[PDB]
């Protein structure tokens, strides 16, 4: 498995923080204080693609925590999951752990490969948890920029 260090903002430039063990928040951040946001582990894994589309997983640079999409309240929903230390990241990733990076302009859309249609979103709001958005176009952000750190 071949990863990439990096970080996301959405369109807005808001950064990604950890708020809690188990979920991000996105929020505007400059200066010293951009030492906060998460550094991902991006990993180029099995899937179907394209040009465009690419499969994914996203993990923390350093922590056994991965982005996964899960049926919740019968609802798809986006979590942060714990995983074996020593069997992650693998080339063959389970489907839960799987995102379609999709290119379009210098914006990136992660769209959840369980779930079809389901995005990484953002509010237009401060602080809120990152979570997985039904729907492209309307208030929730759904496009993001990357920086390489370190890949």
Known sequence: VRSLNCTLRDSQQKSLVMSGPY???????????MEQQVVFSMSFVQGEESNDKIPVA????EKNLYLSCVLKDDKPTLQL???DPKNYPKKKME???????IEINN??????????????????AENMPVFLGGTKG?????DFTMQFVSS
């Open 81 to 83: 999951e714990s995983v």
């Open 107 to 124: 914006k990136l859309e992660f769209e959840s490969a369980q779930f079809p249609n389901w995005y990484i979103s953002t509010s237009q």
């Open 58 to 61: 996203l993990g923390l640079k």
């Open 95 to 101: 489907k839960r752990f799987v995102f379609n990076k």
């Open 138 to 142: 309307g208030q929730d952000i759904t």
């Open 23 to 33: 979920e991000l928040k996105a929020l505007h951040l400059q200066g010293q204080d």
